[PDB]
Swiss-Prot record:
This is Glutamate receptor 2. The record marks 61, 145, 237 as: Interaction with the cone snail toxin Con-ikot-ikot. It comes from the Eukaryota. The chain holds residues 414 to 795 of 883 of the full protein. The modification Phosphoserine is found at residues 147, 181. Ionotropic glutamate receptor that functions as a ligand-gated cation channel, gated by L-glutamate and glutamatergic agonists such as alpha-amino-3-hydroxy-5-methyl-4-isoxazolepropionic acid (AMPA), quisqualic acid, and kainic acid. L-glutamate acts as an excitatory neurotransmitter at many synapses in the central nervous system and plays an important role in fast excitatory synaptic transmission. The lineage of its organism: Eukaryota, Metazoa, Chordata, Craniata, Vertebrata.
Amino acid sequence: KTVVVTTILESPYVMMKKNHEMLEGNERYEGYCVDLAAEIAKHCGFKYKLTIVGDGKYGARDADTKIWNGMVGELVYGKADIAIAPLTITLVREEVIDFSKPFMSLGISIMIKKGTPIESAEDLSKQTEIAYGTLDSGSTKEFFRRSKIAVFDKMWTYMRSAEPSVFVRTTAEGVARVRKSKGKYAYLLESTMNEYITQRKPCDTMKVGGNLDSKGYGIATPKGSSLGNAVNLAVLKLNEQGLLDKLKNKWWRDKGECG
Ligand SMILES: N[C@@H](CCC(=O)O)C(=O)O
């Protein structure tokens, strides 16, 4: 049986190939997670179909309906068999789906337009001229919502209250806002995405400050699925064999364009 893989368009994990409208099936896509999916499938002995998550989201539980959206929802409601994506391992997700051990480490970070007078989350929290926000329906937003650390709680209070919204639907939208705002908007995003984007033209953004936390992305399967065990062992093997580092350097180091 062909395994349905849910994933998300998020550079450099999964990207549409150039001129993709002429292409079909898995051949439409490239990136770190496209390469990782082929390795996991080989190691686990399955054929698979990559499917971009219908709503474009990572996955959160709606506070009002208690329904999961995003890739998490596609696993919970049976629409996909596995998620191979930069999906953060979190407590609320682990309650409803399973995760492999991490395939990549990360933490929350800050992107600014070059020259913006901000060095830290504390700097953001103590002023109002520069607006800032996060992605909807992901783990960064939930981090701020739940934090009891004074600086991050002050940031949450500001973000949830801002009108019009400072939250964006896609990472690309957040980055576009950093640029369009001439640096009057800063963006809170994971260090992995920040490190890729800041090294691609136009070379006008930068990462500032230390990471705010330390966590990992995992391969997710529906709770109790027969694939979970083999997928976890495959992640560990690929790490130990050096393959995850090679893919990281293919999609980050080797893609740099900013000198
Ligand atoms: N990796 C995050 C999405 C990106 C973010 O929230 O900054 C997640 O799994 O929700």
